[PDB]
Design a protein around this ligand. Sequence first.
Ligand code: MG
Length: 561
Amino acid sequence: VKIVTVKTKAYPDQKPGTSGLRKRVKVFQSSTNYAENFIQSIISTVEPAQRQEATLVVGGDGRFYMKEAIQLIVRIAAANGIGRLVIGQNGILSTPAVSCIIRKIKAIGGIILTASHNPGGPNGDFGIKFNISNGGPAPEAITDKIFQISKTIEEYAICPDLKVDLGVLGKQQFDLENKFKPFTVEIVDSVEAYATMLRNIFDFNALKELLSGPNRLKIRIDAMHGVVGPYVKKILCEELGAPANSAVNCVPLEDFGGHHPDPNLTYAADLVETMKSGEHDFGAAFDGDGDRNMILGKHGFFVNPSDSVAVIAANIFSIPYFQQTGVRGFARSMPTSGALDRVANATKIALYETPTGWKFFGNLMDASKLSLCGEESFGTGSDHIREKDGLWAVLAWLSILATRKQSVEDILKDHWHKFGRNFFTRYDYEEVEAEGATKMMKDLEALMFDRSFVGKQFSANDKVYTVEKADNFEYHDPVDGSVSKNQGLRLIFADGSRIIFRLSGTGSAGATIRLYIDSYEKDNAKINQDPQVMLAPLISIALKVSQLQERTGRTAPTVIT
Ligand SMILES: [Mg+2]
């Protein structure tokens, strides 16, 4: 084919976030050269001389416009000199499978066409994310470079006649006019490299015993019509042997079957209705692109994500990878509960508390100081790759059930009985007016910084909470040097309980207040109650010291997780 140079005009808004460039599907398809300038801007960050020998992994979550943005990447990458692109079959590759493949073949990076748990279809959202050579998300320095280039871009190169069959396994080669080396595109089974990686991490003979035997464990895995559907069928049913009705919504749909692929009790209510019946021993759900997960035990028992990372941490040697690797360190984002800290202190393993986001975890994993990490927002991972991994957390739970031979609920009651329970909840106030919400944060922080706040006591039934430390979290990264400030207000009490306030949506008309309550209970009489009843005293203290109702007019949160 011929390489053609197209003059373009730059856009002002293409600034990739930590999740790449997320925008409504109609913007990508209706704004002339929007996608073409973003893709050309990504490729321009690879020095022209390093491109011929380079390989780019390209894949997405199955959503609408994914096939159409992949043919565009092929046309621009070809005309720009990239030697090879490895693409998942039919365009499908979960975010953990793109991280696995970059690292495995030493790819220069990958482009993931996913807008994560967001909606797909003619009316949804579309996202373009760039991962770099360590298989993890591109850092600020690199997304910045892409931003600069996209705003000052005058031209892009494209082969307009190049079309690739994505449904075909194998190598496709194309000659580019007068050029001396051909462009190569390798289509790859979506699941194979990722399942061979997992076959080496976990013990598949113990898992085959656990799922296909006489006395097998009964499981129900909901992939929410997202990308993990093919991984669940090929690894769990076909290789490990679970019955085919163990896999639900396992066919990727372009609109995720009209629902949001977001793993929590109400977005995945279907799977919770199935669990209520008492039939299965274990249940799980995944987000759109496979890096997040929800765990459920028998009868619908919810395993909180902050408790899920502490159970794998307390039972990590039951997984072969960690027996061979050793545990290098534990980590949680700041707002996640203190359950993991209890296990790290009991076990004597370093615990790192970071701002939310993957970057702080990548840094520590690349420094060989982090083996397992978690986030309260259904996120769990290990250093096997440099993205979170939803199915990996399900196989780490199944390995703990195989080894322990007890139900999900008995593992948790047993954990709470050894370490104490960190009752935890996350309150979201969603379109708060921004002046009221900022004033609420500014006033609570002026109050918190008074020289006599530490020492202050609060009560709201039996227990008294004594303020031990109070601050606006700041993190100084030991690896890339960065200093992150203004990450959230914390009232840390001497008993191990904490109240955290973050204004995530800081500015648009609308703002989002996320309030996190973490209440430590060691009394073996209190550890088994409903968390909303046990957290009610500390939630009252939080609304009252913050004057949130007064500041926002809200009498209740939008969502309680
Ligand atoms: Mg995701």
